Amino acid sequence: GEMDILYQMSLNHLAVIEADKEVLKQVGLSLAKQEEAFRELQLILFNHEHSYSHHGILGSSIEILLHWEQNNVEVMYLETKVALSMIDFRRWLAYTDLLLSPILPLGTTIELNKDLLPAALVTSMNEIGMPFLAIVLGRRLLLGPEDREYIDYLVSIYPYGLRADVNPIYISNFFIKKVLQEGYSDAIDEQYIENQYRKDYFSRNIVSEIYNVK
Amino acid sequence: EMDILYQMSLNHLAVIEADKEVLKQVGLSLAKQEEAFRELQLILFNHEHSYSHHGILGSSIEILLHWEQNNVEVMYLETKVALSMIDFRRWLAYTDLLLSPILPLGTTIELNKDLLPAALVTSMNEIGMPFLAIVLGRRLLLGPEDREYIDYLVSIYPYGLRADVNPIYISNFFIKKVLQEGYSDAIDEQYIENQYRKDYFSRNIVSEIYNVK
């Protein structure tokens, strides 16, 4: 498809050889279509954890070590170990995320991860039994005014929805804990997503703000 | 739960007890039938003079609207309820408030282009853009101490909400069809009953389409 050409082109810029570019391509294609596995790596990056592992038979085992002290990352995939810098590790993931990660439909209802809130906010929601649920209002919004990065979703807390007296919320994908129910989608949405949120953003080198491509 | 609350709202009407009871049975039937109730709202907005449906009991519900006379005739079980236009709007407003279903958040709807921007419909037709929208908010109050709500707050699909694409305030009769309902659970059911029905009843807050004052 079109995304495969664009994806291999985003791998040319990494300071690595063509042997490792093919390996990173296969790892990215495999992790991106497995949505639960890719979010686990994002949370590992967010917490600066040290290790990621999503092993399996038939040559599906993937292990990633993040050596935060030496700004090094080791991506092992079928006895082929790929080394690259931490900044190149984030660029690889950012363009994997831009071009290959599924985008949730509008109106999707999700449960967010309370482990990412300040304690005073958690204890306030717990007092009244408010679970951390939300609905997708918008997707991959451009951060103004420079418009050099996007953020994955704009949401409102469920069941209150969008209100006049409360702001919509910008959040990243790693805030999501589970999808309760996806919203409506069809061929119009798939074409719009591919054009506006993948191809047009790739052309302007707009990626998700969490990978912090400076 | 809500049956005795609906009976209370019929005390806002200047009709006899027998007429209140007839209006109760008509409203219990219409609000259960989402498409039938929306058809009546659309007949109201168009100022048509006749409405014809069949209650769940089977008896036909006949409504005659005399706009220059500012009164209405509701016919059910051979009973003719004569009421003013304002009592008609109040009856329907509390029927809607207390009994009409509320679409889940995230529901996808098709908007009737007639009730939408008149000539701008041509603009989205030029690009083949269908009139699909996502429910983002429900029974919205724009500010404090507002005595009326807006049925739904929606964003055009597939663009959604963004800083440069404002959402749209719509009434339930803006909906041509519901394409896919969003997620709902007990949390939503409890919040809908408490905030959008019981609390709005206590404050005399009904849909703005009825324009009671």
């Binding site: 506006q196 047009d200 | 939408l116 008149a118 701008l120 603009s123 963004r162 694409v165 959402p167 305030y169």
Partner: peptide
């Protein structure tokens, strides 16, 4: 150029 911002802002300006 995949989002017609001006037409979408016009739909909302009118109905609101």
């Amino acid at each position: 150029g995949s989002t017609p911002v001006e037409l979408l802002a016009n739909i909302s300006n009118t109905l609101n």
